[PDB]
Design a protein around this ligand. Structure first.
Ligand SMILES: N#Cc1cc(C(=O)N2CCC[C@H](c3ccnc(N4CC[C@@H](F)C4)n3)C2)c[nH]1
Lengths: 266, 336
């Protein structure tokens, strides 16, 4: 559904943002958090969404769509507007409806959110998950409108599969290239580049890593090879940040530094 | 939630009941919710709008599907979504659309009434436009899943006069089946493009005769009285005509309940001959290619658009009414 419609999609026409526009909006939150802490937080909630999705036995495309909604929401809004801890499972819930998976039950959604944060994220959350289904349904009305109802999201998994099929190296490269596609969600790449470009960048790094010579195949593509090199740099940078970051030891402090919602007049 | 963010959004939030006048003006009611003929409160327009409150509270699978798909689809033969209103206070979702004065259910009913008491290529123009819109949906891998005359809207007086608009993209999946393909009635576990193509054929036969071709009297995915009505018109499908009929989940139920000889003199030819439609016409041959029992032996919407019937005089027009004064009365209201 809406497969080759990328150049005429809401995703391309409205949700491929300008990097300077993105950084400018981020400045509201860069008062409370450094650029490094903001990235580390964006990696953290990417990992929370992934763990939530695993718990609910949801497909990768549902998780990837959930991550994009989350990224999109905090690209325009501050971390204080809505609690990301309520926002992340809200994104999962809506992404499953959009992706025709189903409506996760009240009990099952709240219990997955509770169990995931308790078992896997206790280093960052000492307290139990505090939200109820009324909070998730409320947050959903907000997320829906503050995305201009843009629900159809294109990911790089679909072009990547076509690329490695063309190459004929599906067995050798797809497991690694697919993995690198998952990692690009720890970064803003989905908000800056078309999915097929992130797919080419992920396939390129996979080719380097496994020492497969694909120079000719890549030269035979009618693509802006500078844009691909920009994406590759972000992917390489991500791995150095991965090495130098211990979320388990730094995330409780990074979550405390984060701005919090102003309460109603009392 | 941040209070400052909450009050600011609340102040910006456009309300459906503040922007439009629609109370009392309900033109449709069904599983999709309520449709209204609305007018702008600000008066800087004078245009008529179709305003739909979606059935139930919250973002249902159905509401989710319609919003997600309509947001991306852009075709002159598919209804255009203009706005979405999220009534936070009652969790109701409203959708704004241009107002189609006519639909195929109301036009077909008008003709049926007249018989008891269609300019040159109005039927042909309606078919080409129905096919054109479905072809665009199918190109984008979107199935309608529930094509029927009521959701085939047609614009009245205005800049889009006599243009078809396919409506209701909210038939999401995980008592009347006149438009359900025979494979669905035999427990087919998936919706396909050929299911929409079968449905287009039923509309084409209803436009050519005024009668629902598979008109049958009023849970289980298998429906006997409807399958019987299909065989009364088409006949019993030979083994060679649909080899994978054996592969259908309800095939041995069909063998137990039906007998080939019951429908021995049944054909689409004999049905259309009774309803004064020449079997040697290019309209018959196209109709027959859409109404094929076997989904894999059923033509595509792209292939239907290339049929020589559309090259035969008269050509389809962009205005199905083709200048002619629309005899059809405007849509009457309802009471809830
Ligand atoms: N959604 C939907 C839907 C409508 C119908 C239906 O039975 N009908 C007959 C009665 C008048 C309805 C109407 C009139 C004008 N616009 C719309 N619209 C504009 C877009 C959509 F809201 C339907 N509907 C059409 C079936 N599904």
């Amino acid at each position: 559904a809406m497969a080759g419609n990328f150049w005429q999609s809401s995703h391309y026409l409205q949700w491929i943002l300008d990097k300077q526009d993105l950084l400018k909006e981020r400045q509201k939150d860069l008062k409370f958090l450094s650029e490094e802490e903001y990235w580390k937080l964006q990696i953290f909630f990417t990992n929370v969404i992934q763990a939530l999705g695993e718990h609910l036995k949801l497909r990768q495309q549902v998780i990837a769509t959930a991550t994009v909604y989350f990224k999109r929401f905090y690209a325009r809004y501050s971390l204080k507007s809505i609690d990301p801890v309520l926002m992340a499972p809200t994104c999962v819930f809506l992404a499953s409806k959009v992706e025709e998976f189903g409506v996760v039950s009240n009990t099952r959604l709240i219990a997955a959110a509770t169990s995931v944060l308790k078992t896997r994220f206790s280093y960052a959350f000492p307290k139990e998950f505090p939200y109820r289904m009324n909070h998730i349904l409320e947050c959903e009305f907000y997320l829906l409108e503050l995305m201009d109802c843009c629900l159809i999201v294109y990911h790089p998994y679909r072009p990547l599969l076509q690329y490695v099929q063309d190459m004929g190296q599906e067995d050798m490269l797809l497991p690694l290239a697919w993995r690198i596609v998952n990692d690009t969600y720890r970064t803003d790449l989905c908000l800056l580049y078309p999915p097929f470009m992130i797919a080419l960048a992920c396939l390129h790094v996979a080719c380097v890593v496994q020492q497969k010579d694909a120079r000719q195949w890549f030269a035979e593509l009618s693509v802006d090879m500078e844009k691909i090199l920009e994406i590759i740099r972000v992917i390489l940078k991500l791995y150095e940040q991965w090495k130098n970051f211990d979320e388990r030891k730094e995330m409780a402090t990074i979550l405390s530094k984060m701005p919090k919602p102003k309460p109603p007049p009392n | 939630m941040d209070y400052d963010f909450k009050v600011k959004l609340s102040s910006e939030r456009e309300r459906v009941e503040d922007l439009f006048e629609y109370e009392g003006c309900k033109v449709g009611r069904g599983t999709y919710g309520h449709v209204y003929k609305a007018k702008r409160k600000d008066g800087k327009d004078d245009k008529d709008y179709a305003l739909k409150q979606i059935e139930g509270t919250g973002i249902s699978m159905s509401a989710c599907r319609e919003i997600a798909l309509l947001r991306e689809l852009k075709h002159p033969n598919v209804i255009s979504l203009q706005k979405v209103f999220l009534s936070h206070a009652d969790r109701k979702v409203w959708l704004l659309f241009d107002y189609a004065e006519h639909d195929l259910w109301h036009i077909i009913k008008f003709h049926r009434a007249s018989k008891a008491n269609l300019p040159r290529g109005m039927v042909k123009s309606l078919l080409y436009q129905i096919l054109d819109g479905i072809h665009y949906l199918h190109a984008n891998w979107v199935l309608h899943r529930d094509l029927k005359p009521a959701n085939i809207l047609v614009m009245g007086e205005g800049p889009e006069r006599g243009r078809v608009k396919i409506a209701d993209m909210g038939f999401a999946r995980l008592v009347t089946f006149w438009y359900r393909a025979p494979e669905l009635l035999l427990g087919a576990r998936h919706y396909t493009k050929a299911i929409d193509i079968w449905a287009i054929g039923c509309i084409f036969a209803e436009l050519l005769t005024s009668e629902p071709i598979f008109h049958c009297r009023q849970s289980n995915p298998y429906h006997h009285d409807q399958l019987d009505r299909i065989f009364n018109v088409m006949g019993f499908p030979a083994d060679k005509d649909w080899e994978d009929i054996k592969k259908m989940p309800e095939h041995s139920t069909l063998m137990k309940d039906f007998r080939r000889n019951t429908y021995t003199n049944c054909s689409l030819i004999k049905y259309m001959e009774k309803h004064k439609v020449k079997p040697d016409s290019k309209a018959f041959h196209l109709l027959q290619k859409l109404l094929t029992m076997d989904p894999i032996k059923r033509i595509t919407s792209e292939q239907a658009m290339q049929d020589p019937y559309f090259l035969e005089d008269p050509l389809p027009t962009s205005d199905v009414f083709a200048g002619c004064q629309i005899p059809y009365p405007k849509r009457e209201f309802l009471t809830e």
